[PDB]
Amino acid sequence: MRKDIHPDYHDVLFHDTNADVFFLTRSTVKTKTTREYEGSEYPYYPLDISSASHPASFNKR
């Protein structure tokens, strides 16, 4: 891993609002706001859908 050739790679808190499940993972996205997690305040990136929220007729005459 060289230096000063790679983009900024900081922690971001992904939060699926549907199921209210968080996802702590480092990434590059610059979040607008930053909420407080169990450890400290991480850049908050709201998320809409995640892995925890993503998935004859003639007889009526």
């Binding site: 993972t25 990434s27 998320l47 892995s51 993503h54």
Partner: protein, 177 residues
């Protein structure tokens, strides 16, 4: 890299018994993850490719490498060593953060998603998928975007058979079927 810690904690163990391996060192693991974004329209506009390099930097988190044509093809208007694609190889903790992001944040954001066919294995336990719209990743933003683009995601595992490869990927919760 929660998956790095979580793989060595229980995924490595549970795969061994589920596949009936006799040696802990014989369990499959993911070795490298390569992201290919081969842009054939380059060398004729010289604007598409830098936008691809800008896209991969945000997505993978590493400076990508610009792959040059290995052979001259007159049909595709391609000469020796022209830049017709970028690629990035992810290993160690860098792959496991990307895989977590791809499994939980990126794949659900695929429009009209039904699952990935398990018959897309090359036969040596190596998986390769394809993302049509690069906007699925939250790292890239919709507002100041150049244009919609796709990208290859190739997962290289230490497995020797297709059955071991899919069992390994199922452990992480990969969206099969």
């Amino acid at each position: 890299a929660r998956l790095k810690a979580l793989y060595n904690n229980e995924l490595k163990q549970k795969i061994k018994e589920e596949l009936g391996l006799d040696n802990v060192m014989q369990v499959p693991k993911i070795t490298k993850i390569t992201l290919n974004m081969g842009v054939g329209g380059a060398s004729q506009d010289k604007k598409l490719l830098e936008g691809a390099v800008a896209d991969m930097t945000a997505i993978a988190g590493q400076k990508p490498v610009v792959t040059k044509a290995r052979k001259s093809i007159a049909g595709f208007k391609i000469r020796e060593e022209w830049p017709i694609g970028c690629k990035v190889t992810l290993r160690g903790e860098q792959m496991y953060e990307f895989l977590d992001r791809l499994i939980a944040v990126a794949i659900p954001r695929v429009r009209d998603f039904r699952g990935f066919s398990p018959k897309a294995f090359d036969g040596r336990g190596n998986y390769s998928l394809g993302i049509k719209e690069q906007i699925v990743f939250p790292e890239v933003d919709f507002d100041k975007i150049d244009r919609i683009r796709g990208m290859d995601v190739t997962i290289t595992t230490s497995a020797a058979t297709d059955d071991e490869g899919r069992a390994l990927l199922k452990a992480f919760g990969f969206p099969f079927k």
